[PDB]
Amino acid sequence: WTVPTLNPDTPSPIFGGSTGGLLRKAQTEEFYVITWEAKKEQIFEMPTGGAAIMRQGPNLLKFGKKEQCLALTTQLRNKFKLTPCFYRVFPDGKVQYLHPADGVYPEKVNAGRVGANQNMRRIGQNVNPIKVKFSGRMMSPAEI
Amino acid sequence: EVGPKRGSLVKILRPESYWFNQVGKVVSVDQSGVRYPVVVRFENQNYAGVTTNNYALDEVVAA
Amino acid sequence: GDFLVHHAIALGLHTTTLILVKGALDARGSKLMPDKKDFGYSFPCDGPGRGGTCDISAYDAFYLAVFWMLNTI
Amino acid sequence: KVKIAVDRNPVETSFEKWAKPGHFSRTLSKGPNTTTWIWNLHADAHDFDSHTSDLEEISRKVFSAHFGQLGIIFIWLSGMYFHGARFSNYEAWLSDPTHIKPSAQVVWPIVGQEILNGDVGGGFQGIQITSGFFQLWRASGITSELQLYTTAIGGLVMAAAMFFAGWFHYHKAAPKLEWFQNVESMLNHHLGGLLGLGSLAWAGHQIHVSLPVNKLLDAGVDPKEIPLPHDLLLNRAIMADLYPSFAKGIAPFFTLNWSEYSDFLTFKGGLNPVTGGLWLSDTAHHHVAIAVLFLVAGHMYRTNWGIGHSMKEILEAHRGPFTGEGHVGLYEILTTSWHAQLAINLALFGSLSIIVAHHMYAMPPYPYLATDYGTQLSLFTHHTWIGGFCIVGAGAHAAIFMVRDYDPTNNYNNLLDRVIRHRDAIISHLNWVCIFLGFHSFGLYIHNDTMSALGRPQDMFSDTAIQLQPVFAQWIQNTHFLAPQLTAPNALAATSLTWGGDLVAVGGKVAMMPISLGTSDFMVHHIHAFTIHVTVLILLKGVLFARSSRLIPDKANLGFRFPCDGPGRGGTCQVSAWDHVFLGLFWMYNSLSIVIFHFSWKMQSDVWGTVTASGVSHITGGNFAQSANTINGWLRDFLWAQSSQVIQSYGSALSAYGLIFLGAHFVWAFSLMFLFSGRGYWQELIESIVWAHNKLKVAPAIQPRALSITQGRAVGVAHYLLGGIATTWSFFLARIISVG
Amino acid sequence: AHIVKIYDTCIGCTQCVRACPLDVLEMVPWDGCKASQMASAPRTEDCVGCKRCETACPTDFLSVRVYLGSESTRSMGLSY
Amino acid sequence: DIAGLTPCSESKAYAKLEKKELKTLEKRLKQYEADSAPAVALKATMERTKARFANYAKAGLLCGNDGLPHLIADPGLALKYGHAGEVFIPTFGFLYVAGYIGYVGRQYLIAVKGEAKPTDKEIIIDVPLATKLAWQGAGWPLAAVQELQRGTLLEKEENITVSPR
Amino acid sequence: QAALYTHHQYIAGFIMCGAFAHGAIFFIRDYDPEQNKGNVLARMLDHKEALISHLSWVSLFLGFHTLGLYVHN
Amino acid sequence: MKDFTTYLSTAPVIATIWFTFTAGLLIEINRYFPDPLVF
Ligand code: CLA
Ligand code: CLA
Ligand code: CLA
Ligand code: CLA
Ligand code: CLA
Ligand code: CLA
Ligand code: CLA
Ligand SMILES: CC1=C(/C=C/C(C)=C/C=C/C(C)=C/C=C\C=C(C)\C=C\C=C(C)\C=C\C2=C(C)C[C@@H](O)CC2(C)C)C(C)(C)CCC1
Ligand code: SF4
Ligand code: SF4
Ligand code: SF4
């Protein structure tokens, strides 16, 4: 498996448009682009509101935030058993692949993945806030 | 076979546990070296609706 | 008449104290949130999980006590 | 093929389930482990959709639940007729309706409560009623407690039949889904049978009983010597004496000589001078026309013959260049979704209940109803409140459909889809309209309050200072008033005296007179526009964003009734469509509270009042025009001044209204505890209380739990509306009964 | 960004990972529980603070804990 | 007597209030014929009013300047001056009934706790057992002392759950 | 006379609310259990349920009876 | 019949019956001993 390259000229599902689409953020900060393959033309629900028809084979959509892309990712996988992938795109042309990060959906344990933000203790073993006081800034005993 | 006997009643000692100072039934104790091998079942559900939890050998006492 | 109003004042003083005291004693933790101390004095909530946890912070107790204090005064 | 289709002995009639609480739910049937189960059991008892995914089973539950409601309503009516026959002063009131106060509730002498049995008149002591039953029974031609007792027995026989029908159509012969999905047949029977036949039958009773009996009553004939209804039904000579055309029989009807029946079928308009109510001859010709119109309407939809229309064809035919597919998919949505039908039916039924309040007050249909101000105010306010509640319910079930029954595969490029695709345009535009109305409606009141406080009355908006006259409503009033001579030639008089003309006085009191509209009326009509627009904004937004929003893209998965999505994204508290209904209730209450206050002050100030020699003295002396243009004016001259009756009711028969007035202020304040607090605090407090119960070995097996977030909101709004509406109720009834 | 932490009490149910609507969590190989897997939080920068993960966590007490922290365009879940 | 109050029996305001009350009822009794049911009812209320003013005075209640009976709650003043049926005796009457309800309910919860489904016995009441405990609750006070003395009334702290502290 | 009494009684009420607010903050930010082991302060936390449950009982009694007597009257 | 008696033993039913009994008892007492202010 290799990091996929986003083809920006992919056909987009049939949809007349809505008022819940991208805003100025897509042109100044960043936007998200979901891509998936459809084995048949099926009408689906746009997370931004409205019905849309997925096209045979390749499909590409752009959303304002990552949650909207993952929301559509959930519907396609749970209802149509499809396997979509999405990326974060910056206004300078840079593209960043996001999900599935390693090609294996996160819920399925995969090798190579290194644990992060893990504490070798139970929450009841956290120190009292008095111990983490006067540190560089407001922090929680959990962060230590 | 380390751990309390299956079917025995033990009292939880974990302070942040909903069943602290409460008695549950030993469902099973994992002989493999897991951090918390004692599976305990309780009649009263917690705030999440759960009625079972895993505890370490020290977190449980026959009662 | 003075007897009845004085017991009403006692009602307000004990209730406002109950709200304030309960907030200070449960400020470091409760059965619903055992690690409340790790979240600080003022936090929105701990989410809808565990049955719901709106107004669980000690700051939320003070906010509720002010209504009872204004009612007492 | 439209046909009767049913399943035999579908459900066994046993008490086995009666002894198993929560049997209807897969989650609740497991029994209670915490107190939340008890609430969940009652909250999910009538949610059949959530009980089962079978539409036929849901439809059978709905049909039988309706028979149960109909049986409940029949018992209620039988009680009202029974209390009119055994615990009332109706027979005395029939002889002296201008002085005797209607009463049909007598209290037992205990703990000193007998004081509530006021001296209503007619040698009777009881609680004064404002339901208007006495005037309805007089209009129907009832002259004896025997007739009221017989109708009461009939209603109980009907209630027993309704409960039987409910049991039979669910346990013995349950209609199949195909039966319920016969919308074309259902509309034909409800328009032709229920409505047209019902109106025709009522015309029969009015022409053969209501008209002669009431004509004799108005002529001064004692109720005892009036012929019994059957005597009039079996003798034509008596009816011929009262109405000459009856001597010709039904020949004129079949010979198209309808003009002969002009003596009982009339178009007088206006009000009967003796009673102050609409002419029964006008109500008779009306119900006859309604009956004919609805009999025709009930022959429009196709059933088992080729003639008739197909609702699906009509809908699919109505499509234009700006609306994509158009009304495609609606027939399928309105034949497979009860929540969709309930949404439309609740919306229209509430709007109708509100229209009834305005029409019944301006055109008082019952004899001696207009001069009974307690009944008039009660009727208008009651039907206004029922309408508002139903309108909010319409919003909730529209969101329930959008969340549970909406399928995009059946709604592509249709009106519904295109509405959801421009929801942000709709809500944002409505948002601005609400802000504009708010400033240009309530801002005018603030300007006046400040100008008056600053001693600058000439700079205020008033009929003497700057004027904001409702010219359009003034022109319509003039048009309707002059209608009889040009646009409505046959009519003797205008439909209502509100439009203009001479006033009608009965018993020395004003029944109805012209209602003038000035700056204060213009200002309060715009407050209504603002309050309604804002309430729509909340309800509409809740329905359009029920499935998803820019903040939450999977709201539909979370469901219709959910507390929030957590404190993330800044805080997602109250994002569910259910929460929009919760907020809509408060604005609906604010709007209708202002509407009923407007009605009471305007009527007490400019319409109601004793008619004396050369002059009519109104209850509030016409102070609405110069006192309703400021908030201070409303608080002082309305709330503070008219609260004197309720605050001074102790030691009298209206003492109950004083107690309810305080009790209602209490329930309202008690709601704020639930509305301003959160379950997190209560759960912890319960934990310390549970500790005391554990210490003394008195802790319950069913674990005590704080109310759910949604339950907390539902309890708060309920007590808020109960307290607030009851407070106005006590204030209104005490005030009107005293100065009626 | 909000602080998300996993505790040794984790049983490797993967429920939190399935409940997360922004892909902040994943399952990594582990030897502390029978499931031989433990939840990890390598993308907390995309966390909004919904606390769905905590609602899905069945351990007593929670094995996954969210501490609301610095607010960003992603943390506030803003599409603008 | 106490607090500068005066016996209702010797208060002039108490007497004026009784006349004021009977005069309202009489002003109304006029508009009705003598045997009319309304007249009979107003007469029975007037008789009940006369009996109340007389019964209250006979009970030795004290009246303030308002001419209304005031209740003495100090056990010492009530017993020494004949005012114990006002707050003292009522206190022991209520305490007996309230403890009765509590002890029976506690006995019920304890009995159903040893069953298969205690929660079921709380939504569906074991009527026979409930009636038995209801009758055996008359001797609750002695049972409560006997439980307090055996150390069976309270629970050991070690068996009661609490928060982390 | 009226203004001074009401003014000082409302300022007093807000200050009392503030006092408990800071007591709750103290417990969360400064309280160190190890340095207060066995002391009167730690004892308070050890019987917080008793303290709160008793304040709950008193408030309930005053509320039910003070309201009940006004309503009866 | 056993199931019917179990339904009559349900919390709400028993509450209605018990409260109706208690209310009735108090009402009858005040009906035969009116205006009881002191013992
Ligand atoms: C002795 C006659 C009888 C018997 C033995 C049964 C027995 C049964 N019925 Mg049933 N039913 C009957 C008459 C009867 N029914 C009648 C006359 C109707 C027409 C209304 C119905 C309509 C009906 C429906 C639609 C359904 C059942 C269902 C059931 C089954 C489970 C529900 C249940 O009964 O729990 C007991 C329920 C109750 C005791 C609730 C009582 C409801 C009353 C009418 C409400 C009264 C409210 C009151 C007027 C106002 C309260 C205000 C407040 C302030 C006090 C069960 C085996 C359900 C089923 O099939 O299982 C899923 C089902 O959905 N019945
Ligand atoms: C002349 C034909 C006729 C009439 C008069 C009615 C009348 C009524 N129907 Mg209806 N219906 C009809 C035909 C008719 N239906 C047909 C052909 C179908 C199949 C397509 C349906 C399917 C249907 C459904 C699904 C429902 C109704 C409902 C109702 C009631 C609504 C409540 C109301 O507003 O009225 C006010 C109430 C009254 C005025 C009380 C008087 C009612 C008496 C009994 C009139 C008799 C009506 C009945 C149809 C006559 C046959 C009875 C016979 C079988 C013994 C109402 C009484 C609702 C309901 O649940 O009712 C229980 C409802 O949900 N109907
Ligand atoms: C539901 C509406 C309704 C009803 C029920 C009636 C009923 C009646 N109207 Mg009437 N009317 C109505 C509306 C109605 N009207 C309206 C809207 C108008 C305005 C146009 C009028 C204007 C009007 C006038 C001017 C007159 C009547 C008259 C009458 C009466 C005589 C009818 C007649 O002459 O023969 C009608 C024929 C029949 C009714 C057929 C009878 C069939 C029988 C009942 C069937 C029995 C079958 C059974 C098997 C027998 C066995 C019995 C058993 C014991 C074995 C009658 C009681 C007349 C009257 O008042 O008489 C004094 C009259 O003068 N009406
Ligand atoms: C024909 C009218 C109608 C019908 C048939 C329904 C039917 C239904 N509604 Mg609905 N609703 C209506 C009108 C109607 N509604 C109106 C007018 C409103 C606006 C207020 C609502 C607002 C509404 C909401 C917000 C919800 C429903 C829900 C439901 C569904 C479940 C009901 C339930 O929760 O059971 C249980 C019913 C009860 C427990 C009754 C509660 C007791 C009431 C509310 C107290 C009212 C005060 C009372 C009179 C006080 C008496 C005096 C007191 C001293 C005792 C159900 C299919 C629920 C749903 O769809 O599930 C997702 C839901 O959430 N409705
Ligand atoms: C619960 C609060 C409370 C309060 C504020 C009072 C207040 C009072 N009580 Mg008292 N009392 C109480 C509870 C209370 N009591 C209870 C629960 C009992 C049941 C045993 C009694 C039994 C009682 C008796 C027998 C007497 C009083 C008396 C008095 C008055 C003078 C008593 C004294 O000197 O100091 C205040 C008293 C207390 C704080 C506690 C109890 C009272 C003590 C034990 C009685 C000692 C009285 C002493 C002889 C002083 C009076 C001298 C002389 C006039 C008799 C005083 C206003 C005396 C009185 O005025 O009678 C005419 C009296 O003799 N009380
Ligand atoms: C000597 C007195 C004193 C001192 C030194 C402090 C000091 C402190 N308090 Mg504090 N407090 C006090 C009294 C005091 N308090 C009293 C009397 C109360 C009861 C009302 C409180 C209740 C309280 C709470 C609930 C909290 C604090 C907090 C804090 C800490 C930071 C909060 C802060 O100051 O940010 C800035 C404060 C503000 C910007 C004020 C907010 C604006 C309010 C609503 C006033 C607005 C009124 C407005 C102008 C009215 C307009 C009317 C006009 C139009 C006519 C800080 C160390 C916070 C904390 O613990 O830190 C986490 C906190 O949660 N205090
Ligand atoms: C008028 C409004 C109101 C009322 C009456 C109350 C009353 C109460 N509050 Mg409260 N509060 C309010 C507003 C109100 N609050 C507001 C606006 C807030 C800010 C959100 C708070 C915040 C608050 C907090 C934080 C706390 C309270 C607490 C309490 C309770 C204190 C103990 C007590 O006095 O017991 C007396 C009991 C009563 C006064 C209730 C009377 C009994 C009823 C009326 C009799 C039954 C009537 C009839 C038989 C049945 C009616 C129902 C019918 C359908 C069958 C008390 C019942 C404390 C508490 O929970 O107690 C432990 C507490 O922690 N309140
Ligand atoms: C047995 C019983 C129960 C009771 C259980 C328990 C443990 C109750 C606890 C009681 C405790 C700890 C009481 C502690 C202190 C009580 C004190 C100091 C007593 C105060 C009473 C005073 C000062 C008397 C005041 C007056 C008297 C003489 C009577 C009246 O004249 C009025 C007044 C105020 C003047 C269960 C389970 C609730 C179930 C049910 C039956
Ligand atoms: S509704 Fe309550 S739990 Fe949910 S986000 Fe708001 S405060 Fe938190
Ligand atoms: S709080 Fe929400 S976004 Fe953050 S890790 Fe948990 S589920 Fe994911
Ligand atoms: S839900 Fe809890 S126990 Fe399950 S994998 Fe996530 S952190 Fe571990």
Numbering used by the authors:
A (entry chain D): 53 to 196
B (entry chain E): 34 to 96
C (entry chain B): 516 to 588
D (entry chain A): 12 to 751
E (entry chain C): 2 to 81
F (entry chain F): 63 to 227
G (entry chain B): 369 to 441
H (entry chain J): 1 to 39
The authors write:
The subunits PsaA and PsaB are arranged in a central heterodimer, binding the P700 RC and components of the ETC, namely A0 (a monomeric form of chlorophyll [Chl] a), A1 (phylloquinone), and the [4Fe-4S] cluster Fx, forming the PSI core. The Fx cluster is connected to two additional [4Fe-4S] clusters, termed FA and FB, which are bound through the stromal peripheral subunit PsaC. The unicellular alga Chlamydomonas reinhardtii PSI is much larger than that of higher plants and contains a second half-moon-shaped belt (composed of another four Lhca subunits) and another two Lhca subunits (Lhca2 and Lhca9) on the PsaI pole.
Using negative selection of ultraviolet (UV) irradiation–mutated cells, we isolated a mutant (TSP9) with a single amino acid mutation in the Rieske protein of the cytochrome b6f complex. The W143R mutation in the petC gene resulted in total loss of cytochrome b6f complex function at the non-permissive temperature of 37 °C and recovery at the permissive temperature of 25 °C. We then isolated photosystem I (PSI) and photosystem II (PSII) supercomplexes from cells grown at the non-permissive temperature and determined the PSI structure with high-resolution cryogenic electron microscopy. The TSP9 mutant contained the PSI-8LHC structure and the same LHCs (Lhca2 and Lhca9) were absent in the TSP9 structure. Without PsaH and PsaL, the only possible state for TSP9 is state one. Our structural data showed that the mutant responded by lack of assembly of PsaL, PsaH, and two LHC subunits (Lhca2 and Lhca9) in the PSI supercomplex. This structural alteration not only reduces the excitation landscape of PSI but also prevents state II transition, where LHCII migrates from PSII to bind the PSI complex.
